[PDB]
Amino acid sequence: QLTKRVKNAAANVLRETWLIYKNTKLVKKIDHAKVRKHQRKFLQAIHQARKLRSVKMEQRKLNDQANTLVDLAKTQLE
Amino acid sequence: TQLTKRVKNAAANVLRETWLIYKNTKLVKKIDHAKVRKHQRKFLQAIHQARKLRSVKMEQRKLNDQANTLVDLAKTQLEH
Amino acid sequence: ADQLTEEQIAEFKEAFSLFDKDGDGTITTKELGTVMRSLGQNPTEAELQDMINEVDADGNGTIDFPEFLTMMARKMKDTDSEEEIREAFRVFDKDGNGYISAAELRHVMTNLGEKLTDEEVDEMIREADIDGDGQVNYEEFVQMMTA
Amino acid sequence: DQLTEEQIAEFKEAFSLFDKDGDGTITTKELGTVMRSLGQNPTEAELQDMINEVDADGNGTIDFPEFLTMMARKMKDTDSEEEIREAFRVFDKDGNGYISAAELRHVMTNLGEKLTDEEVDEMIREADIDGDGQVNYEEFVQMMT
Numbered sequence: 001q002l003t004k005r006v007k008n009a010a011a012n013v014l015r016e017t018w019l020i021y022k023n024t025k026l027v028k029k030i031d032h033a034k035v036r037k038h039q040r041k042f043l044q045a046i047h048q049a050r051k052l053r054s055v056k057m058e059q060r061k062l063n064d065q066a067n068t069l070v071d072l073a074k075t076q077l078e
Numbered sequence: 079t080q081l082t083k084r085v086k087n088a089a090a091n092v093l094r095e096t097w098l099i100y101k102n103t104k105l106v107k108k109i110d111h112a113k114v115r116k117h118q119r120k121f122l123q124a125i126h127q128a129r130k131l132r133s134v135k136m137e138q139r140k141l142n143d144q145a146n147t148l149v150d151l152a153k154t155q156l157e158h
Numbered sequence: 159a160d161q162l163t164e165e166q167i168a169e170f171k172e173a174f175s176l177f178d179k180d181g182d183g184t185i186t187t188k189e190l191g192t193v194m195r196s197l198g199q200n201p202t203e204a205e206l207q208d209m210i211n212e213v214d215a216d217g218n219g220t221i222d223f224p225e226f227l228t229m230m231a232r233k234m235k236d237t238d239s240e241e242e243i244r245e246a247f248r249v250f251d252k253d254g255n256g257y258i259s260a261a262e263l264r265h266v267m268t269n270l271g272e273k274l275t276d277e278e279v280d281e282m283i284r285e286a287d288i289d290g291d292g293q294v295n296y297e298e299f300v301q302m303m304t305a
Numbered sequence: 306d307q308l309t310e311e312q313i314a315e316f317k318e319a320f321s322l323f324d325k326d327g328d329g330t331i332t333t334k335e336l337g338t339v340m341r342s343l344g345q346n347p348t349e350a351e352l353q354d355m356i357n358e359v360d361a362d363g364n365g366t367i368d369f370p371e372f373l374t375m376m377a378r379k380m381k382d383t384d385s386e387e388e389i390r391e392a393f394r395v396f397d398k399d400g401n402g403y404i405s406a407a408e409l410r411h412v413m414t415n416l417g418e419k420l421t422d423e424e425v426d427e428m429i430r431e432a433d434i435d436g437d438g439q440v441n442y443e444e445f446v447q448m449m450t
């Protein structure tokens with residue numbers, strides 16, 4: 001799930017990147033309001049990607065830490 | 079492509095039953111035959127399934143290209 | 159686009175006649191066979207029937223104009239979305255080699271005026287990078303753009 | 306899927322390895338002491354997260370039932386994970402971390418199964434996420450689960 005959210009955020013980054021490009025480079029008259037809208041969406045997605053990746057990274061650390069504790073408990077199993 | 083997922087799913091069953099056959103045949107003291115027979119049976123079914131779905135997938139690929147040929151022909155009438 | 163224009167509908171009405179060889183208002187499996195062979199292919203009877211069946215919404219065994227039109231509307235809609243994604247791919251894939259590199263993705267951003275770290279551009283690549291080769295090919299790109 | 310009476314009694318003994326002051330609960334400070342004694346130095350936030358993951362009733366500390374329930378789930382997951390590792394080690398006959406088509410063909414032959422070499426190759430390809438033509442551990446895990 002966390003992985004999904006990460007890839008989904010990065011996908012929005014990519015989709016909005018394209019939409020900004022198209023509306024900026026591939027039109028005769030630039031629709032500035034449309035460009036501002038996608039730019040806002042771009043920034044929201046990038047903030048989200050950054051946020052989710054950070055959580056993922058802290059999660060990997062925590063997993064090894066928790067497994068250390070789990071292994072300690074398992075030392076008592078016969 | 080739900081089909082492709084079903085294909086991968088069927089191959090996954092083949093692999094799982096292969097392991098369960100190995101385990102129950104090579105990695106036990108006394109072989110439990112009813113259980114070996116069970117995994118052999120599910121192995122066969124999964125194989126039958128993987129073959130069926132792969133066949134469907136291959137034919138769908140051919141059909142996609144044939145149909146797209148028809149679609150492209152219809153599209154010749156679109157102006158610009 | 160979601161819906162066909164009046165003009166496209168009229169054009170597809172003309173297109174229908176290309177398949178309806180005998181002008182009876184329906185396309186049959188025999189007619190699809192004639193059409194395919196005229197295009198240099200030789201589908202089996204079962205393949206021709208499959209092509210009829212996937213369009214024959216009312217199940218009466220032949221394709222009428224509204225059935226053909228409905229299918230064509232769906233195809234035009236799909237083609238438009240797939241074509242936009244290809245257009246995007248070609249732009250990101252600056253050198254046309256089939257792989258979007260981290261460098262190429264940077265250039266896109268930078269030309270848009272965006273401010274991403276080189277590390278951040280790298281992370282985006284790795285997230286779309288299914289086969290682990292460090293680059294984004296067309297299929298990986300399509301998955302990302304449609305997710 | 307459940308702990309035996311013996312395992313429960315052993316985890317009750319394990320609880321005391323964490324409950325440094327013997328008050329019947331494990332606190333964030335106690336996990337700090339445990340982790341440091343094992344050679345690691347988690348931040349306060351990390352220790353808090355490790356408590357929170359287990360603290361079902363949300364009172365800030367871990368009691369024996371909460372600890373035990375978590376351990377039950379970990380033992381369940383460990384067992385399934387260890388089964389899949391065992392399968393992998395067997396299929397990856399040369400231990401190089403990749404199940405080759407040849408390795409899988411041999412497994413089938415040795416089980417007396419009758420798959421065409423093409424069918425075995427097709428299975429390798431259905432499991433082969435990174436396209437290198439062989440199945441690594443992570444690719445195998447995704448298949449078996």
Ligand SMILES: NC(=O)Nc1ccccc1
Nearest residue numbers: 068069071072073075343
């Ligand atoms: N006493 C002891 O050796 N504890 C331990 C060792 C390795 C991993 C986790 C815990």
Ligand SMILES: NC(=O)Nc1ccccc1
Nearest residue numbers: 147148150151152154197
């Ligand atoms: N008339 C004609 O050229 N038809 C055609 C050509 C290529 C692809 C599909 C259809």
Ligand SMILES: NC(=O)Nc1ccccc1
Nearest residue numbers: 145148149177209212213
């Ligand atoms: N399956 C399918 O696409 N049939 C078809 C396509 C175009 C025109 C007439 C029939």
Ligand SMILES: NC(=O)Nc1ccccc1
Nearest residue numbers: 066069070355356358359
């Ligand atoms: N998160 C987490 O696993 N905490 C924990 C684990 C084992 C023993 C005590 C606490």
Ligand SMILES: [Ca+2]
Nearest residue numbers: 178180182184
């Ligand atoms: Ca006709």
Ligand SMILES: [Ca+2]
Nearest residue numbers: 214216218220
């Ligand atoms: Ca019909």
Ligand SMILES: [Ca+2]
Nearest residue numbers: 253255257258
């Ligand atoms: Ca390139």
Ligand SMILES: [Ca+2]
Nearest residue numbers: 287289291293
């Ligand atoms: Ca790639």
Ligand SMILES: [Ca+2]
Nearest residue numbers: 324326328330
């Ligand atoms: Ca305590």
Ligand SMILES: [Ca+2]
Nearest residue numbers: 360362364366
């Ligand atoms: Ca508690």
Ligand SMILES: [Ca+2]
Nearest residue numbers: 397399401403
């Ligand atoms: Ca190997």
Ligand SMILES: [Ca+2]
Nearest residue numbers: 433435437439
């Ligand atoms: Ca591989």
